[PDB]
Design a protein around this ligand. Structure first.
Ligand SMILES: Nc1ncnc2c1ncn2[C@H]1C[C@H](O)[C@@H](COP(=O)(O)OP(=O)(O)OP(=O)(O)O)O1
Ligand SMILES: Nc1ncnc2c1ncn2[C@H]1C[C@H](O)[C@@H](COP(=O)(O)OP(=O)(O)OP(=O)(O)O)O1
Ligand SMILES: Nc1nc2c(ncn2[C@H]2C[C@H](O)[C@@H](COP(=O)(O)O)O2)c(=O)[nH]1
Ligand SMILES: Nc1nc2c(ncn2[C@H]2C[C@H](O)[C@@H](COP(=O)(O)O)O2)c(=O)[nH]1
Lengths: 350, 350
């Protein structure tokens, strides 16, 4: 019964625009089921045609799919139940929300622990690491989602499921979209430790955390997202935290070098760090993840068309650049543009 | 260049005989590279024709391969450097040992922490959970393998590698064998929490922790190992620990019910727990892992040939039983026996 499965994986340090990619593919491929293993580290963003933004930390953004029936948050999820309930109630259309019983739960004590600092440099301090560690530690009395939610208003809108139930549902689903979060180079396996997150960030880890059965993974297509200028989170110098290195064929630059205003963080108001494109990073992530199609986003950032074409050429040595993003809306993503069309798009978006 | 990749995954609670399976497939398929992401929870066993046992906690057991060139311990490894050095020096033939720089390391403090009890019921108390959590927590000063080994005699016999180096090596390898450890139903995602280990135990997690590139995983064959009678570790009643449930279509039994002597644990001398076969568990693990070939081991345990054939019939509803084990040696494993041949083997091994 399964005919299509798209896996969306971030090939840099996050913030490549996976909320946009998810919305775009949701409309293009019309999946019936969205899978995700969210953690509350950052909010992914879908900007509507009218300029309104929907920001999701706990739910996928393929909700543009006209065929959407169900969202399944897998056992590798790390769930803020308050935030999940809030995002669910705000959804535009009614859909079933299934959550695996063994997902971790984020409690205030986990946020409190990370708020004291002294852990990963540049940590979002979302509590995600502490919450996940509590699941992994298996101390008596630790409750995973299946038990923790019974105490919480969220229980009235979720179906708690085990893997037998999830398997049956997924094998009966025609088109599946699974949305990764974070970034390949934040992988605790493949990143520059300790400038990284608490888990691996690969196609394989996404399959594991979403609980996708391996025969479905075998037919899946992998869409890798990357920016023209990779970005890391801000430093926290008062806490003595530098948020980490770039690849050796990247150099750190300033937003002003692109004629852009500095990008600050949502709450703390700290300047994000930007770097030039790394072909080594792109090729390494493409190979690790088995990327079949690349989404190259922020194609309007390079200061010349030649600079954009050099990035395209680097990627295309290893994978097709199937989707090109010139802005934050679904209507700003273009499917396999010719080089001639690319010229017109670049000029128009600058 | 990659032509063959076999992934060995345990479909029950461990102790299905993956050391035997690895030795058998190593000789059958002659891989050039063995991949593993070991943790020190238990020792896997290869019994030689003469009755000698080799017990590995840190190294694969496909070392029967006449074409073996290299062992690669992936970034998801959790490494006791003393034990790894000891096992490496005892290997029969010279091979290259590569270890990913981001593997976790087990220190005495991790063993000490788990030795105090009060964590997962039935824990092996190997320190594996604490050591892995230290990697995940990213506290300043925590050293992963790449830095921790420089202080240790092991550094003289290992090549520390990153993912770019591992990728290049793996893509140039004709035949790869990756050996899972632990058991599907010990998965922190798919198991009965907290009667489980610290990570997922699936094909997907194995790919992630071994650092196998996804395009290699795509061509891989999955060999799932299972026993006629699933087994859990012993209870620890003095510590108030029960080691956990079986599936609902299994019932706990006694070794005496099979005419066998009680199986005790290597050090603590505690009785292992045995249960009848669960078809639900088998089918669930086959589906989650995408198992293509099943190794059914301990085929000499069922008290009648009909009881063995019922187990075979249950498995074969979903996957071929390709290998059948009637004893602990490579010469006790039989490839796709006919039912008539099975009759003679069962009679002879009883
Ligand atoms: N091509 C684009 N041009 C300008 N802004 C864009 C473009 N694509 C996306 N954006 C905006 C939307 C968000 O405000 C921001 C980051 O996108 P977002 O979807 O939140 O990233 P993400 O989900 O990949 O990673 P993160 O984990 O950092 O949230 O960039
Ligand atoms: N068919 C068999 N009959 C009898 N003994 C066997 C058979 N196959 C293997 N053994 C023995 C070898 C070991 O002493 C024991 C468990 O095997 P072993 O390779 O250590 O398990 P394993 O690696 O799958 O799991 P564990 O994590 O418990 O070590 O069973
Ligand atoms: N852009 C982005 N960065 C993340 C995300 N999760 C973690 N990071 C980065 C921020 C830090 O550089 C590093 C560690 O953060 P944390 O996992 O929150 O402790 O990983 C995410 O979802 N998006
Ligand atoms: N047979 C076996 N059991 C294991 C292994 N690792 C963990 N377990 C089981 C023992 C307990 O029931 C449970 C938790 O143990 P631990 O991960 O050591 O805290 O998982 C392994 O490698 N082999």
């Amino acid at each position: 019964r399964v005919k299509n499965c798209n896996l969306i994986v971030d090939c840099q340090y996050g913030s490549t625009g996976k909320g946009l990619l998810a919305g775009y593919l949701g409309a293009l491929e019309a999946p019936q089921v969205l899978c995700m293993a969210p953690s509350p580290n950052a909010g992914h963003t879908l900007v509507e045609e009218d300029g309104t933004a929907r920001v999701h930390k706990m739910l996928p953004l393929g909700i543009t799919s006209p065929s959407l029936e169900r969202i399944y948050l897998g056992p590798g999820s790390v769930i803020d139940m308050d935030r999940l309930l809030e995002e669910y109630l705000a959804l535009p259309r009614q859909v079933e929300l299934w959550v695996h019983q063994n997902a971790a739960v984020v409690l205030q004590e986990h946020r409190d622990e990370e708020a004291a600092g002294g852990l990963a440099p540049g940590s979002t301090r979302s509590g995600a690491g502490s919450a996940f560690i509590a699941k992994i530690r298996r101390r008596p009395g630790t409750l995973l989602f299946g038990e923790a939610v019974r105490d919480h208003p969220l229980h009235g809108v979720v179906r708690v499921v085990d893997t037998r139930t999830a398997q049956d549902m997924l094998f009966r689903t025609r088109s599946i979209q699974a949305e990764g979060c974070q970034g390949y180079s934040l992988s605790v396996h493949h990143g520059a430790y300790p400038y990284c997150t608490a888990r691996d960030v690969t196609t394989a880890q996404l399959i594991a955390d979403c609980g996708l059965p391996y025969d479905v993974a075998r037919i899946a297509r992998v869409v890798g997202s990357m920016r023209t200028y990779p970005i890391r989170v801000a430093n926290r110098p008062e806490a003595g935290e530098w948020s980490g290195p770039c690849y050796p064929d990247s150099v750190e630059c300033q937003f002003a070098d692109l004629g852009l205003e500095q990008e600050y963080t949502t709450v703390t108001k700290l300047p994000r760090r930007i770097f030039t494109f790394s072909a080594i990073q792109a090729h390494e992530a493409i190979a690790q993840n088995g990327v079949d199609e690349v989404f190259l986003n922020f194609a309007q950032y390079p200061p010349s068309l030649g600079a954009l074409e050099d990035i395209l050429d680097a990627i295309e040595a290893r994978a097709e650049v199937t989707y090109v993003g010139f802005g934050p809306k679904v209507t700003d993503v273009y499917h396999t543009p010719t080089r001639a069309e690319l010229e017109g798009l670049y000029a128009r978006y600058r």
